Every structure is written in C-alpha cells, then in structure tokens.
Write a protein that binds this ligand. Sequence first.
Ligand SMILES: Clc1c[nH]c2ncnc(N3CCc4[nH]cnc4C3)c12
Ligand SMILES: [Mn+2]
Lengths: 10, 319
Amino acid sequence: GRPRTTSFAE
Amino acid sequence: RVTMNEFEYLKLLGKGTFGKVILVKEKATGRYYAMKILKKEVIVAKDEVAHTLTENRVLQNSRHPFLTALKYSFQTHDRLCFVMEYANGGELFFHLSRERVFSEDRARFYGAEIVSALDYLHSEKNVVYRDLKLENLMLDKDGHIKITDFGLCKEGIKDGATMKTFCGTPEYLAPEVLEDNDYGRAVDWWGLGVVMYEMMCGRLPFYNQDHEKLFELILMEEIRFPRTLGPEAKSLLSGLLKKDPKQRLGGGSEDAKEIMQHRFFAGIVWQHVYEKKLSPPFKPQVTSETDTRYFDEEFTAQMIERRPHFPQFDYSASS
Ligand SMILES: Clc1c[nH]c2ncnc(N3CCc4[nH]cnc4C3)c12
Ligand SMILES: [Mn+2]
C-alpha cells in the first residue's frame, strides 16, 4: 500500500 | 479522418501534469477505447515533444497481445490524441494496493506476460522500455497484461548497445543507471525484478521516501527475502536484482531467453503465453463496458510554434 511514484526524465 | 467529434467522452481514467486519459466510445462503430489527450502547448513547454513522438512510433510499430494496441493517432489545432484499446481491469498498482501480495502463481502469470512483451520489444522492435512499474502495467477485460506509457522508451537499441539518459522512476532505477554508467536493455530486467518482488513480497526491495537515500540502498544493500518466499522465486528475484547488469538474469546475449529458462517459470509454455491460452488468475468483474470500478475515484468521479503542427503524426490502423 505504498504511495504512487512519479516517472521522470532529466 | 478523425477529430474530437468522432467520439463521446464518458469517464476520466487518468490525469497527470502533461495530460489525461478518457474512456470514449466511437460514434461510427459503438466501440469503446481509451483516448490519451495531450495539450500541444503544455507538451512544448514541459519539454515532452520527443517523448510523445517516441510513444507515437512505438505504438504504431508494435503488435503484441500484451502491448496496448493503437487504433488512431490524430491532432487538432491544440491537441494530440491517441486512441488505444481500453484496459478495463485498471493498474496492477490498484490491485496490489488492496490485496498486499499476489500468490507466486498469480505473479508468475503476470511475469510471463511481461517477459513476453519485453522480449518482443527488445528482439523484434529494438526497443528498451525503461519505466516498468506497477502503475503502468494494466489488465484488460480478460485479465491479461497491457503495457501502457511508452514515452520513456529508447528506440534503435540493437543487442547490447548502450544509452545515457537519466530517466525512469526513482524507486525502480537500476544500479548501473544510478552509477552514471552507460546502460543496456538489461535495465528492463532489473525493473522486472522490482515488479516481481513487489508482487510476491508486498513491498519494494529498496525503500526510503527520499529519492536520494533510496539510491544509496539500491547501490549498497542486498535485498531481503521474506521467509514465505519459495526457493525458485527467491532465485529469480536474486538473479533479476543482481546489481551488476552483466551478472543479471537476462543480462547476456540471450536476453529474455535466459529468464524464460529459469526454473521459476518451469512449465510455463511460452508459446501458450503469447497465444493467450493461459488461464488468467483474475478476471475483472465488470458490469458494463463503462464500469471503471478498477480505476481511482479521484479521476472517475470528475465530470468532463507554441502550438506547432506535428508532421505526419496522424495514423489509422487497419487489417
Ligand atoms: Cl494510455 C491507455 C491505453 N489504454 C488504457 N486503458 C486504461 N487506462 C489507460 N490509462 C489511464 C490509467 C493508466 N495508468 C498508467 N497509464 C495509464 C493510461 C489506458
Ligand atoms: Mn517517490
């Protein structure tokens, strides 16, 4: 029941 | 010949910073689809153009039972839109947030489908996916995997060729990416390992809320193995989450074929996986084609040069 993650690109 | 007018907009399925996805029905056919709608100006400002073109090509060029099929791509004066198969079963993230863990057999089933898709992207399409995670693994109406969200894919990666972009999702990043090394298609088997670990252990193998301390765990610590985990599952997780990609399961020239061989997958028949002949351990229990009980309430409960032309963005599938 973890928090939702966020995809990224640098 | 497709425009916003060709569809009705029914339920919001998703909305992040670049755009949104809506359950729609096509007026001429009565068929239901998911439409991802991007505002051109926001894509240009947020620097998402090259990601959007990648996603357009990857969808156009891919044909696989566990990859979201593209029906239309079309633009208006201010929007880019993809019309894709609707995955009625929602995100694996949804299911696993409510059930805590999957049985080894259930995890094995999704894992096999994921491996099948990844193997096709790598081998047939020269594509590395890079952002495998629970959030972007959906289930269709029969309960099979659909991979969505191709924007972080790398194209033109043939065999063990390498890449440099620091991209993905923090909690899933492979060590070789964090080391600022050139990295190969084996990053997708690290992702696979993290997904499979979450499925069968009910948490991430490396966890700290703060991305930076998390990265330290990824480079420094060995994974823990709950005592309920069987010896095959243990060995698979340990092989996929090897920190050196050269030592990783799937990290050699055989790529996916090495994972497919692994004893955890014994008596998975890979050709039946592809032909969709394996029995899904979970069938989404929907009333209608518009029942979105497997999607998050936050979204479904909502009521429905700066803007350049994108050359030849338009596409229509057929036979
Ligand atoms: Cl894109 C897309 C194609 N087919 C879909 N069927 C349901 N939902 C979808 N989206 C909404 C939720 C979600 N979660 C992660 N990516 C998505 C995209 C899509
Ligand atoms: Mn985070």
